[PDB]
């Protein structure tokens, strides 16, 4: 998309992540572990459902019947009615196609956005203690055990403690 995260520097997504939309998956001394991030998952779903609720809602304009099916109306006013109705149906078909298209473009470029926002939150969490791998992975220098990763998730990770070690491991 526009932010180059989805179908971008993150090569592909994880078909096993069912907890939510976006999450972390760490490899450390204590084994692999994958778990979602509620914050951004909800940040995207709330926006998509905003689109829906704004779109699927009815107008209160009621239309009456102006021509007849069983007893056809006069020819000139019938050709005018049909002409008008075809022009209107053309307008609405165009409005609908353009609408769906642009809401889909903005939806994809929105999820891409929320991903890049998460990665760029982890990045500012791990200030100098970790290096950008490039495939959306962060290479941690110090020893981050299965409880330290949780501090990375909860945004409770204090980098000052581990900065001494990871800095030197340059």
């Amino acid at each position: 998309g526009l932010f180059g995260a989805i179908a971008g520097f993150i090569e592909n997504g994880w078909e096993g992540l069912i907890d939510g939309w976006y999450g972390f998956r760490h490899q450390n001394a204590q084994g692999e572990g994958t778990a979602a991030d509620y914050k951004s998952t909800q940040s995207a779903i709330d926006q998509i459902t905003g689109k829906l609720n704004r779109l699927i809602e009815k107008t209160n304009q009621q239309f009456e019947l102006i021509d007849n099916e069983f007893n056809e109306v006069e020819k000139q006013i019938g050709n005018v009615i049909n002409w008008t109705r075809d022009s209107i149906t053309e307008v609405w078909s165009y409005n609908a196609e353009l609408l769906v298209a642009m809401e889909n473009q903005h939806t994809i470029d929105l999820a891409d956005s929320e991903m890049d926002k998460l990665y760029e939150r982890v990045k500012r969490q791990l200030r100098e203690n970790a290096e950008e791998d490039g495939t959306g992975c962060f290479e941690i220098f110090h020893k981050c055990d299965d409880d330290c990763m949780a501090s990375i998730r909860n945004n409770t990770y204090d980098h000052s403690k581990y900065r001494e070690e990871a800095m030197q491991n340059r």
Binding site: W14, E15, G23, Q27, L65, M115, C137, I152
Partner: protein, 106 residues
């Protein structure tokens, strides 16, 4: 040693269309164009008159088929193809105008 960021995906994608690409595959999409029809006239909370063989204009003149509707009263007036506005042949002048009048007549 490391921590990775990423998103989800499914093996059964649903294809949509965008400004910039035709048939881009996404996770879950919905429908905006209704085709689910109900093959009945749904009239909950409406006084309905199924004219049947009685034509709508025949409720004024009163041919035999329309005896049962001489003083009808409705919120929803249902016409049928088998309606016959006349018994002795003839036709109303500006008949569609008077039809449009009687349709919103109650």
């Amino acid at each position: 040693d490391k921590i990775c960021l990423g998103h989800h995906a499914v093996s059964n994608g649903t294809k949509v269309n965008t400004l910039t690409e035709r048939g881009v595959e996404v996770v879950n999409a919905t429908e905006t164009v209704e085709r689910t029809n109900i093959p009945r006239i749904c009239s909950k909370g409406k006084r309905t008159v199924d004219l049947g063989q009685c034509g709508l204009l025949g409720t004024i003149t009163g041919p035999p088929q329309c005896d049962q509707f001489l003083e009808f009263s409705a919120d929803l007036i249902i016409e049928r193809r088998e309606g016959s506005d006349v018994c002795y042949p003839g036709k109303f002048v500006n008949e569609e105008a008077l039809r449009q009048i009687l349709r919103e007549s109650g």
